[PDB]
Amino acid sequence: GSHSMRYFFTSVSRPGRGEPRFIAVGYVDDTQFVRFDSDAASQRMEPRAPWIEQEGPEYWDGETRKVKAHSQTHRVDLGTLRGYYNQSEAGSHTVQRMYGCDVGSDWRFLRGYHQYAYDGKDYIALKEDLRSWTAADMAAQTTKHKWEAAHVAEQLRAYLEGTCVEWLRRYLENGKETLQRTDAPKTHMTHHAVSDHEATLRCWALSFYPAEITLTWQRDGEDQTQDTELVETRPAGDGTFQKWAAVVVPSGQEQRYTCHVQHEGLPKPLTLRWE
């Protein structure tokens, strides 16, 4: 179906403890393929998916150089931001950056991103037109002017609409067996008596990919959103994902309840009921 590539950058200052921590990770959809850790011995971009290991030394040397440049830029940014907001030098702060592109089923460009956050809050973000910027406060305003004069948006757009999309396609092809797979969820239901008058019905979805999925409970066809416990979709660690929705059922009403599962790998939505 639809696909996307994303790079996540986190930079955390450590006052009096030297250079800031820098961590970069790349994703194709819900699969990480690369990473760089400033505190690692290698000082290189490393593969994190088997299908990227085929990339020669030129790819790794190149990516290593660019991620190092990314790193140095963020180290400076931490100082500039500490100035914008008149903050001391003893406090630890966080800068986060994310950029990437979305493509439809036809693998054609659909949407591009490039966003910054400071201490967990939106700082500056490229708008959907990839031509304008969003700045909430004065600090961000300054940055916006700077980036407007250096025509940053125009260059970022070239990457997001061109390079980003092109290489996203390349990764999809090179890693077809895993990146282009759709694993329908394995579903089952558990039943446990919490007391004499009640029991827990839990609907399971396992070993599915991608991560996007919908799990709901119904009682006689009526949604139970606020009476069902929904856990966050979670990684199994093997590249697949998990999720469950539980509902407390009064003993004797099992038949009234239905679990509904929607996922890319399912032709039609599944309906399950304890019986």
């Binding site: 955390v12 966080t94 396992l206 856990v231 979670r234 990684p235 199994a236």
Partner: peptide, 27 residues
């Protein structure tokens, strides 16, 4: 969330997962 990669089966190898999310700062 604490959980196993595969359904728990006594005597069978598995993975114990602890998934932490939605936190800030990163420490």
């Amino acid at each position: 969330q604490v959980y196993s990669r595969h359904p728990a089966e006594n005597g069978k190898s598995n993975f114990l997962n602890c998934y932490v999310s939605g936190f800030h700062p990163s420490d």
